[PDB]
Amino acid sequence: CTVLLQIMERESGNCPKDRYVVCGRVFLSLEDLSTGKYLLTFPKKKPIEHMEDLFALLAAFHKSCFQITSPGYALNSMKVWLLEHMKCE
């Protein structure tokens, strides 16, 4: 494949400035995946030390955003839930 970054400005109603840009070029093959090398495979492959791997899960995975409002307590339970019950790093 080839990767094309497209850009459209919004303020100017002339539709003026579409700076296309061809950013690299991606090859894959089955011979490559069979040796891993590009896969992200779960567990044991925990310690994420190429940050791209982290940006992949924030791109591939389904995202939902919740607002929490306690009208009658305070909210310090969240980090505990996250770190102890969910055991987050």
């Binding site: 009658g72 307590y73 305070a74 310090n76 339970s77």
Partner: protein, 160 residues
């Protein structure tokens, strides 16, 4: 043990309490004569397996004890007159299960702590926060009165 300790903390037996908890954790925690450290170290044992129901659990009581003891300790340290040791524990009160009147009183209490240290602008900050978050805003207005008296801004004291 939680409930028991709740009774003793309601009845001011802190000497026996810390010893009970010393017994509870390993007695290597023997010289840890502090209470609040000892309450944090206290670790109820299980994830509460599929057992008969209950109105309250060990964790929700450790979470009630840390905030109750830290509030009560912060008021004792205030009245006895050491408003620098207060701030630590009166922040460890809000950093927990802190109901909205317990929060209002922690903010007033820190207004008081700052007034005694001679920091009126900070104390004004905490008192405005207590007015805002609270529906029980008597004691804040009192602390403002006492702070403008300490200063001299007497018309303000009178308006408060």
């Amino acid at each position: 043990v939680g409930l028991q300790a709740a009774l003793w903390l309601s009845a001011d037996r802190l000497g026996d309490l810390a010893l009970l908890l010393e017994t509870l954790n390993g007695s290597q925690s023997g010289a840890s004569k502090d209470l609040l450290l000892l309450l944090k170290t206290w670790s109820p044992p299980a994830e509460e397996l599929d057992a008969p129901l209950t109105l309250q659990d060990a964790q929700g009581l450790k979470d009630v004890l840390l905030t109750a003891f830290a509030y009560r300790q912060g008021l004792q340290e205030l009245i006895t007159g050491n408003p620098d040791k207060a701030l630590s524990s009166l922040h460890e009160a809000a950093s927990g299960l802190c109901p909205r009147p317990v929060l209002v009183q922690v903010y007033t209490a820190l207004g008081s702590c700052h007034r005694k240290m001679g920091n009126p602008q900070r104390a004004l900050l905490y008192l405005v926060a207590a007015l805002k978050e609270g529906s029980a805003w008597g004691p804040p207005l009192l602390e403002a009165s006492r702070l403008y008296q300490q200063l001299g801004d007497t018309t303000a004291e009178l308006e408060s």
